[PDB]
Each structure stands twice: as C-alpha cells, then as structure tokens.
Amino acid sequence: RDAERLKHLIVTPSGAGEQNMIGMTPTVIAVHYLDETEQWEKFGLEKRQGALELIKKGYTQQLAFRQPSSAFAAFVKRAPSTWLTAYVVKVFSLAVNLIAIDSQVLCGAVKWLILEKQKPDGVFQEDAPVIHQEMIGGLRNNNEKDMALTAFVLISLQEAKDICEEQVNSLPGSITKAGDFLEANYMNLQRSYTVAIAGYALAQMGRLKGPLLNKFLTTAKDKNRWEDPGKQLYNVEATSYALLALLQLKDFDFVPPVVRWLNEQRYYGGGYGSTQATFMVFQALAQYQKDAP
Amino acid sequence: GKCGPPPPIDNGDITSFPLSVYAPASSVEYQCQNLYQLEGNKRITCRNGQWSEPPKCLHPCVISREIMENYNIALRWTKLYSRTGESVEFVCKRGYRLSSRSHTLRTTCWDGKLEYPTCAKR
C-alpha cells in the first residue's frame, strides 16, 4: 500500500478527549506502517519529522483529558469511558517507539481498567459510553457486547504488557481472567466480528486452540475474510484482527489469501467512522510485513 | 533497615507504583478489584527491613441461574454477583417448599462460598 495513497492520514489532531484520538489515530498508524515497509526514502524522509511532531501533539493534547484516576473521557467532567481508556492504551502502546510516552500515564490507565472495570468473571464493562460511537468500529450496537468489549480491552492490556508488567503486577492475572471468560464463551459466538476480535485476544495468550481455533478458521468466508452483513468497514476491521491472530499462530499457510483480500479492498483509511478500520488494517499489514519470509 | 518490593496479592494491587527499595517507616496501600472485599489493613509499613502483613481480597460469589433451577428456587426480588458480606434472598418456586435439611432462603456470600437453599415438591 503506497505512501502516496496514504498521505492524507497525516493530520493535525484536534477536539476533545474523543475527537483528539480520532485525529491521532491515522497519523500514528501511518508512521508505524511506513516505518515497517520502509517507504520513507521514496515518499520523503523530511516528512517523517513533521509526522512525529503531529503525534507528539496528539499525545500532549490527550493528556488534558486524563482524569485524576488515570482514566479518560471526552471531557474532564464526564464519567470515564472504559472503551476510550482502553483505546488510548492501545494507541499509546503502539507509539512508544515513535515518541516519548510517560509510563505512568499508560500503566496508570491499565491499572484503572483492572481495578475498577473488570468484573469477577473477567468481563470488562463500560459505564460511560463514548459520545462518538462511530469511532468504535464494529463494537457499535453489537449484541455480543461483553465478549467484544472484553476482547478489545484485553488486546489493549496485552499490547501494554511488556511496558507495564513490572509496574502493574495485577496485569497478568487480569489478563488470565479475561481470557477465561473469552475461552468459556467463544464457541457460542455467532458474529464473525466477535469471533475475529476475541480470536486475536485468545491467540495472544496461546489459548486459541483445538475447537476454538477451528471455529475461528471455519468462520472465514472463502478462507480469506471475516464478515457480517452490514457496514463493510466492520469487516475490514474484523479481518484485520483475524490476520493478526493468524500471525500470532504463525499459520503462514492460511495468511496469503487474507492479505490479498485486504489488499484488494484498496482501503486507504481516514473517512467518517473509520477510526478502527484505519488503525487495525495498517496494524495488521505492518505486522504481516514484519513477520513474513 | 530498608524493605524491598511490597508483596503481590491476588485480585488487587498497590495504589502507587512499586519501587526496588523503600526507606524505613515507608508505607504503601492496596486496593482490590471491583467487588472484592479487602480484609486486613490496606496499608503496610516498612519496619526493621520487613513489611507488615498484607491484606487479602475476599472473593465475591457468582449467582447461578442453573443451580437455582436445579434447587427449585428463584430470587425474591430483582445482580449476578454478590460481595463478601452481602446477602441474597431466595424463594421457593411455586408448589415447592423448603427441604428439611436446607439452608435458609436468605443467604450470605463469604469469600466465594454461597450456600443455596433447596426446595422440594409439596
């Protein structure tokens, strides 16, 4: 996917605690992807400096919406969102090798999630939904919500693990308990989106196996995509999570048609309600590039 | 007289970030996850190069609809999880009455144990 088709993802973030992350998202992942696929020399190595500055600005502006709890919401006076806080953790984690991320911000957010928003059976719960529902991709109006949100938060926790494990020793047990919940209910899932996202979450822990692994694989259409009737952006997102799961499994046999389908979408990110699609497709393709022979 | 890192506890963590080494008289506090009940002192202190006893996090209880159906009971009012120390009130389903050996219809969660009452057919 060619840098010139993605140049529009480099943008100045603005707005409050949610919209700022909507803006930070495409820039972060564009840089991540261009780094991995080494496209900077052709596209213009001068431009990377400006992108990193835009990412630092996003980070810095987001800190105005960090509450004393270490959680985030659109506004300092709005109750904190479980989803938004976990999204910040996912984004800041992937950016730790682009700019300086204060580990107390990141690991504080992680610890809040664990201590306040995890239920005894491992489920993560939202008590203050984001205002801009379009930013949450295929989680929106999903009826399998406990599994979908539990997977989402769990992925974030896993992506923060290396950085926060030592400072937050409740992290591994929290991660395990969420996994329990996902493992216990995975077989009953109906929606491909949920199957994909929870699948990646379990694969990161090496707990996608046996029948669950088979359900994961067999849920694909034509061995190349995970899809449900509805917004196509949800399927791109879903399939991106699936690809990441496959990379975790190192099932490099299954991968190439999936990458092909994602590539054939010619999805270049950035539009309305595109925050999750944009982050996930480029995360997944970047990882594919990094791991492929 | 320094202490090393504070101990881990299940289903909880400290409210600060942990250090390699702590001065004497230092203290840190624990917090349990949601619906887990802190037992013992939340605070531990470094005295003579040793931490005081850390607390525990007492488990809540899951309320099982399957067991309720099996035991011919239902909730008197209408909450899937109960804190340690918190109670749940059941009733016999219609046409059933308390067993002779049965726990009371009002029953309390203690550290993950909940005794369900059982009702039998009249």
Ligand SMILES: CC(=O)N[C@H]1[C@H](O[C@@H]2[C@H](O[C@]3(C(=O)O)C[C@H](O)[C@@H](NC(C)=O)[C@H]([C@H](O)[C@H](O)CO)O3)[C@@H](O)[C@H](O[C@H]3[C@H](O)[C@@H](O)[C@H](O)O[C@@H]3CO)O[C@@H]2CO)O[C@H](CO)[C@H](O)[C@@H]1O[C@@H]1O[C@H](CO)[C@H](O)[C@H](O)[C@H]1O
């Ligand atoms: C909320 C309340 O009034 N609590 C007092 C309680 O009242 C009983 C029912 O509340 C509980 C319960 O203790 O059994 C509260 C539990 O947290 C709930 N457990 C879970 C897991 O959610 C249970 C559970 O919902 C039910 O047991 C399910 O069957 O309920 C309360 O709901 C019930 O309310 C009735 C009311 O009695 C009736 O007149 C009206 O028409 O309908 C209401 C429901 O729609 O009343 C129950 C009493 O029989 O009773 C306890 C002691 O028996 C306390 O009085 C409790 O108040 C707390 O007391 C503490 C001191 O011991 C402390 O001061 C707290 O501040 C008080 O809230």
